[PDB]
Amino acid sequence: REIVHIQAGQCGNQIGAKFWEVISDEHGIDPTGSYHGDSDLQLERINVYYNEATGNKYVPRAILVDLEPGTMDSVRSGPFGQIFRPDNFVFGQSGAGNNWAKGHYTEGAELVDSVLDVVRKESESCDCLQGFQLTHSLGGGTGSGMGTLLISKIREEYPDRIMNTFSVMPSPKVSDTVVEPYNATLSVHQLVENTDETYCIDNEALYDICFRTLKLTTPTYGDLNHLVSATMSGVTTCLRFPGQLNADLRKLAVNMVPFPRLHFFMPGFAPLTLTVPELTQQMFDSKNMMAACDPRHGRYLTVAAIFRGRMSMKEVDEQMLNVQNKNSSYFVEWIPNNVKTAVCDIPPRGLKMSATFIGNSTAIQELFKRISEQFTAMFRRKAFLHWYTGEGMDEMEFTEAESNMNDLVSEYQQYQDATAD
């Protein structure tokens, strides 16, 4: 049944706004919240993301959070600003300052109770809550710190509900802030313990796709978010339309997560703006991944593929087998039948057919290794720590966060090197 969306910080509210832009378009919901669509095979599972207010109005089950009021006001003036319920906007006064400690412990802790009041109001109205999804970044302050605090706080009141998340990773290519490896490593510490299924949206991968593949010398956030919105639409297709396979967040978690800590996925998408072999060949390719990791450098524990558009289901079964059989080295032998596939007749906007990829590869360690270097290069000489230790933290937490993320890398390596006998 119901999923409660949350968007935290500048990044989280922008990609969240673009997510609600695209899925409202797919379900045939205009900015006034009115249904004007052609198919019913749009309203069947509309209640997963929308509430039915009086006048046949469809309002997103979305909660907009930020310590900065500026980024939230830009959402209300955007294309789908008025569709959101006005009470769900939970704005702060101070601002983040790109500090995880301010987001997690002090200034974000001031605001966290007023967010929970909206969450509890939305969750009480649900017939059967699946769980929650948080769109946010790990580099900044609000989305990084307060987002992980919200997860911990919501886990406390809803311990048997799913908590997935769409975590945007930092990169030197896109971002200029130097403290982001601290913020990311501190956030990853929390996500390892308190989330069921994280989609790793890497800004390095989105830059490289925009620069190399899409061929853009000047890649804006709008160019990056076009890929993210298309990815987010793809991975939630089985949740949003009447489908056989992985219709809820728990079933996806049961299929994709063999071990509790290893729940950090590698999303993929094709085509990047066309036959089924070409779609299948593109979606598994390293250049179509939204995490900057080569899957040839590791092994797939579990995979989920979502094909969209009218196509031969016979052909989809063959091509998904042909890539599996002829690349069997890159799938663990000790999880048989680990690649599941779903079909959906309704394609995305513009495309005739598309394919979305969700992969729990061991090669995701490359992402966490890259963050660990950028963390350690600064942390060896205790650089920029007065920002955090002034806020009330101590060097234990950084030592713990470093060690906990390096354990995650060792665990991904441990099961990569694992064998049948």
Binding site: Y105, E156, E391, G392
Partner: protein
């Protein structure tokens, strides 16, 4: 023979009644043990989250005494 005939039908009733009784006690013990285990996991999950909240209070209080 009549005494043996009564012994057979009673033994048949004994087998059914023991099967019902053994099935009931196996299930009752399984559902009780499972209830205890699931509640123990949610206890440890919230006891972890409260230790995070206790630690979070020791950051607010620690910033208070750094001036």
């Amino acid at each position: 023979k009549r005494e043996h005939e009564r012994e057979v039908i009673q033994k048949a009733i004994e087998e059914n009644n023991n099967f019902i009784k053994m099935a009931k006690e196996k299930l009752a013990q399984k559902m009780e043990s499972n209830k205890e285990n699931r509640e123990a996991h949610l206890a440890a999950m919230l006891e972890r989250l409260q230790e995070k909240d206790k630690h979070a209070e020791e950051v607010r209080k620690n910033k208070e005494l750094k001036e």
